[PDB]
């Protein structure tokens, strides 16, 4: 089930997630942790184990975790995360 | 990638306290998604959300679906060894 959610960045330019995946032999990218009291956590749409498929209308295919973390961090104010629900 | 393994004691409900992810047509890798509170896996402390699972009791999970991996884990009674790569 695909989905998208726009999250407002906190004062430290974070949404509040950890990610995993996007390595050799393991292409897919996932939300690993959603931290308490962050935008992601308080929105409630995303959760551990949902698959990250895009950021602000662009695919994360082929990208590494550092790469995707930068794709998110570059985007100020708010960011849309495109996902598949576990 | 830091490989390891851990033998966990099954609870009275034949559980270790984990849910898992991946194991899919185009995302072949399998992961631990959640470690539930007050379970063998949570009380042991070795494994955590995001660790990749590579095998169960000396056998690989390569190519299996998550329902198959859950069945593999459930069939072993008493204790089971989870081979993993650490996040
Ligand atoms: O929350 C973001 O907007 C981003 C998003 C990117 C996609 C991970 N998260 C991060 O920058 C971090 C990260 C993780 C993996 C990689 Br690979 C890279 C970067 C994860 C979150 N922390 C801080 C953290 C630390 C401990 C508890 C809570 C928090 C906090 F987030 F502040 F709530 C900084 C690094
Ligand atoms: O803990 C296990 O030993 C196994 C291991 C298998 C590989 C997931 N886990 C499971 O049986 C479940 C499962 C998940 C995904 C698939 Br795909 C299939 C099965 C997850 C754990 N629950 C019970 C659960 C539910 C809610 C709160 C707590 C708990 C409890 F486990 F008691 F902590 C039963 C189903």
Numbering used by the authors:
A (entry chain A): 19 to 104
B (entry chain B): 18 to 104
Give the published text:
The C-terminus of the GluA2 subunit binds to the PDZ domain of the scaffolding PICK1 protein, an interaction that is required for AMPA receptor internalization and long term depression. Aβ produces synaptic depression by enhancing the internalization of AMPA receptors through a GluA2-dependent mechanism resulting in a reduction in the number of dendritic spines. Multiple compounds from this series were found to show a similar increase in surface GluA2 levels. These findings demonstrate that PICK1 normally functions to transport GluA2-containing AMPA receptors intracellularly, and when PICK1 is absent, the intracellular GluA2-containing receptors are released to the neuronal surface.
Our next strategy was to utilize a structure-based drug design approach and visualize how the compound was interacting with the PICK1 PDZ domain by crystal structure determination of compound 1o with the PDZ domain of PICK1. We crystallized the complex using a method of protein oxidation and carboxypeptidase treatment of the “tail-biting” dimer in the presence of 1o in a similar way as described. The structure was solved using molecular replacement under standard procedures and the resulting structure was refined to an R factor of 15.5% and an Rfree of 17.7% to 1.69 Å resolution with good geometry. The overall structure of the PICK1 PDZ with compound 1o can be described as a dimer of oxidized PICK1 with two inhibitors bound in two PICK1 molecules. There is a space between the sidechains of Leu32, Asp28, and Thr56 which forms a small subpocket that is partially occupied by the CF3 group. Additionally, there are van der Waals interactions between the R2 bromophenyl group and the side chain of Lys83 and Ala87 in the S−2 pocket. Lastly, R3 of the compound nicely mimics the c-terminal amino acid of the peptide ligand and forms a hydrogen bond network with the backbone of PICK1 (Ile33, Gly34, Ile35) while the cyclopropyl alanine sidechain of R3 nicely fills the back hydrophobic pocket of S0. Compound 1o demonstrated selectivity for PICK1 over PSD95, GRIP (data not shown), and Shank PDZ domains. The compound selectivity can be attributed in part to the small size of the sidechain of Ala87, located between the S0 and S−2 pockets, which is unique to PICK1.
